[PDB]
Design a protein around this nucleic acid. Sequence first.
RNA 1: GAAAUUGUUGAAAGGGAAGGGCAUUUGAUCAGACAUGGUGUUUUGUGCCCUCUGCUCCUUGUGGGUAGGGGAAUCUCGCAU
RNA 2: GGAAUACUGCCAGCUGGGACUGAGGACUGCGACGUAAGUCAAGGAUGCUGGCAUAAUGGUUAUAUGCCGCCCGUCUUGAAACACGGACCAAGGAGUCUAACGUCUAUGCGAGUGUUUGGGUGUAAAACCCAUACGCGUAAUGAAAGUGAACGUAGGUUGGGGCCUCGCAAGAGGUGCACAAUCGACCGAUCCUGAGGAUGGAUUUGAGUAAGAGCAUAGCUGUUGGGACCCGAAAG
RNA 3: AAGCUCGUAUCAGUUUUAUGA
Lengths: 33, 241, 131, 152
Amino acid sequence: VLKKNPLKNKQVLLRLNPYAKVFAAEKLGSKKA
Amino acid sequence: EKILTPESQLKKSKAQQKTAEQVAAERAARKAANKEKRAIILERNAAYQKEYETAERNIIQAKRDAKAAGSYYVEAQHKLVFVVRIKGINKIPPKPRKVLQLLRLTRINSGTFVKVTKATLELLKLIEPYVAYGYPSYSTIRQLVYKRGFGKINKQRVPLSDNAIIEANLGKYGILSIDDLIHEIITVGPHFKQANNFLWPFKLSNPSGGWGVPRKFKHFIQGGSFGNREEFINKLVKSMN
Amino acid sequence: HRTAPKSDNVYLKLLVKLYTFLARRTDAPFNKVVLKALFLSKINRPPVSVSRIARALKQEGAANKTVVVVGTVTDDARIFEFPKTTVAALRFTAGARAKIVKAGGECITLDQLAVRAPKGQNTLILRGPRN
Amino acid sequence: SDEIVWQVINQSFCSHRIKAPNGQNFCRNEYNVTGLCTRQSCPLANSKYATVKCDNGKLYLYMKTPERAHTPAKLWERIKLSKNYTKALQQIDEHLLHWSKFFRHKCKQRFTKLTQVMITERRLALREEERHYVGVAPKVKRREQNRERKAL
RNA sequence: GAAAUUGUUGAAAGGGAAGGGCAUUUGAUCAGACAUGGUGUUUUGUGCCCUCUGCUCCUUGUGGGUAGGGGAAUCUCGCAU
RNA sequence: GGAAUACUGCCAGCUGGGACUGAGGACUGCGACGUAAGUCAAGGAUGCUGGCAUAAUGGUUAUAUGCCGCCCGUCUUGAAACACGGACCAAGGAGUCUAACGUCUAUGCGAGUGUUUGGGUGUAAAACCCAUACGCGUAAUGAAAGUGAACGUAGGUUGGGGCCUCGCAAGAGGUGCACAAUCGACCGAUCCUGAGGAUGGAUUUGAGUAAGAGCAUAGCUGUUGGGACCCGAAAG
RNA sequence: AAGCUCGUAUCAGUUUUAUGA
């Protein structure tokens, strides 16, 4: 009915891409080499 | 005695139950199917996350190994461009205007992906004064598909916002989620024509910061906006998003 | 594309009202052909002669078909013989009506055909000569 | 039949319609549930038709059976609906057994409003009002203008 | 008894143009409920209420109209306080 | 040799400040969180609080202020123009009617169709009935004279809306309407053969037959004539 | 404007390769 946007609004960013939970837990963007 | 149900209404209850018990059993065997589907999507995204990481690390490592060995590493030829219309509808010559319709760049500030080959480079050459094209990141495609990403179903510019939609339409071509679609864009896969054409030509706003330049209609190389900008397209499109 | 009938005969509007329901609920392409055919004008609904029904039943393995003319069924004096078959149409002319009944078969309306063949099993739709 | 009755009154005249400026249609056939008129919400087109009315304080529920299409003299069979609200809605329900859910809650709804029309008694017990509407006939409006100006 | 047009009175404006559109201030001025409850308990008092006896129109139970008495110590069933 | 730090880029990092919007209207769906029970920022705003009837508020007119606004209409030419029309107000005022011939749509009936020149009847220019005729169509091929449409599921093939069998489907096979393409035939007419024109060959031809679609009323409208959208000329 | 086949591989003010003056 209305366009909820991912990137913002955490909850819709979990229905798209269930891996985002894992991405947040391990940080992954903040990764050391 | 006592009143009885009509023999149409008696039938109603029976046929409703027949459909309802079927529907409840069908629904219950779809929650389990979507749960299993969710698990497939999760492990695929883990596989892609690992793949993109190892991709950029091997480019870094190859560059490091060239300078160490005293050789020169040629980087892989950019195989995907993102073309954004920069000029309006009016005072456009026939020869480029047809080409802009063929890239689905009808209105101003409209953006599409193009497969880069021998043929399409000459198409981009014709429309040079009217577009700003460049090579997208992973980040920008991800931002474009989540915010300005829309699907073409029979006609109808449909909002994505759910994996089930892409699964139904493009499940034929091995794409079964939103990030499967993004994967088909960034790495120009076997089904690129299908995944790109499914995506509706993006409708971008004018850039948040501005165009930078005082005058827009010059080449980027000489303080303009049009033509190839290669890497700075990511900075531009993110403001236009 | 044609949407609604130009006709003002409310009984024809009732057939449209019926066959629009059967057009979307059956999902068989028989009903969509009939419902398209009801919208057609009077020049584009030519009268199928009883002779063309007789020609149509010479067709091999078409002994037990229910022939459906969306236009009108008209009488032909030239032919003698006529099979025992169920014919469905809008208008049966008094002569043609009498010919089918006396031969053995029935003459039925399109809603009777909608009952007997909802999806449209074992049928044949004829059309009159336009050119 | 009845489909042929409807189409002939939907257009081609139901000679008791009010076209409101809203484009709305109102059947004033005293026996309809909704004051508005639509298909099988007006009592002529439909053959099975229930309604609540009042003749006195006694609120009856009239009922029209397709059995009586021959005889219009005794079309509407009617039943008194006690007077207490709770037992009356229960009284309603039994009559509406095995009908459309339209007449089920809509006669329930007619009964509701027409019972809260008996707020008339509330207005008429605590009346005692020292006002009462007086007409101002334009002859009097000048007998009491042009004679005052002649008085002065 | 319309408009053009004319006088009077009142209001307003007027440094070589007025009338129009978007928006607002000031001045003048007109609107702006014979709206009054709703709900849940408690005195009583009545009736189409309980109860005793009936009478009458008709069509299927899930009917309608209408008298004579009694009775609230059961009953909110309704309406009045 | 030892760390940094700018710069570029990323974060499905965190935490604020402001504006605008609140569409929709029982529940279904995609989800997250919770061991569960559930709950939630998850298919579009809810909760609390205040201002009222001599109200609250909302509008009209009059002007002021900021910004904007060439005199309407007709007729030319490449547009601007030029020019012609306009003192103001009321009322009047211009594509009509008819005939001939079509177009399409609707209605009636249908190889037919058309009552209304008439007669009978009538509650009276209405309505209701109808005889005999006639109109148009129903069977064609030619120039004076004629002939006449089945080798036939009124054809052989190919397609061809549909329908039937199989298949969960996807498909395949069968029958195939109108129609179209191809091969032909019947009928009449061809170029000859000459028994007045028999007979057999040469080939094509066709508002030809394939196995009827018309007639009438009405509406929309076109064409032409009627004064013919209205007004305006030198005349005999 | 309507009717008829189709709804497609029917095309395009475009690029590319191929093959000539």
